[PDB]
Amino acid sequence: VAFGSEDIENTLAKMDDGQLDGLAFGAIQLDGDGNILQYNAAESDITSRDPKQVIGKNFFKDVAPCTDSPEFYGKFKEGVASGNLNTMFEYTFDYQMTPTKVKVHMKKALSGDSYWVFVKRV
Ligand SMILES: *C(=O)/C=C/c1ccc(O)cc1
């Protein structure tokens, strides 16, 4: 239930949008190409994005352009390709929002066809 948990993908594997909105950290589920599958309440609180509005949109191309870099998007693609996405790093979100320092945790989902992007303020 906590950010950075070693088995976080197991816990969240069953959750629907409802339980996902209950997390203390931002949670985004993306497919291989980075299209948004799920986007919870906590993430919305940090970025101002309307969940219903971003579902279906491409995270790296349209929603979060500042993440289009080797340091974020680069690693997402490496993980999709290797099949073992799992990395944590510091990042700053600043597109159409006050510059906000966060800690990010990307981790492949158990379904093997989706990927998680977790975020919390620092
Ligand atoms: C940089 O522009 C990041 C923007 C952003 C990150 C995460 C989100 O959920 C929404 C926008």
Query: DSSP states of 43-87 as a string?
Result: HHHHH---HHHHTTSBIIIII-GGG-SIIIIIHHHHHHHHT--EE
Determine if ligand 1 sits within 6 Å of the CB of residue 29.
Answer: no
* Resolution (Å units): 1.8
Q: Residue 4 belongs to a domain with what CATH number?
A: 3.30.450.20
Experimental method: X-ray
In the sheet with 114-121, reading across from the earlier edge strand, the strands are 36-39, 26-31, 114-121, 100-108, 86-93
At position 64, the amino acid (one-letter code) is: A
Number of independent structural domains in the chain: 1
**Dihedral, CA of residue 68, residue 113, residue 55 and residue 62, to nearest 10:** 20
Cβ(70)–Cβ(60) below 8 Å: no
CB 57 within 8 A of CB 63: yes
Q: Does the beta carbon of 49 sit less than 6 angstroms from any atom of ligand 1? A: yes
Classify 113 as helix, strand or coil. coil
The C-alpha R_g of the chain, in whole angstroms, comes to 13
DSSP bridge partners of 89: 104
Short-list 98, 107, 102, 94, CA closest to 119: 102
Q: Are 106 and 71 in contact (CB under 8 A)?
A: no
Residue 37: domain span? 1-122
C-alpha of residue 74 to centroid of ligand 1, in Å? 15
Q: How far is the CA of 45 from the centre of ligand 1 (A)?
A: 11
Rounded Cα distance between 51 and 65, Å, is 17
26 CA closest ligand 1 atom index: 9
Q: Report the C-alpha gap between 94 and 24 in whole angstroms.
A: 21
Q: Is the CB of 120 under 6 A from ligand 1?
A: no
Classify residue 83 by burial, with Cβ atoms within 10 Å: 0-12, 13-18, 19+. exposed
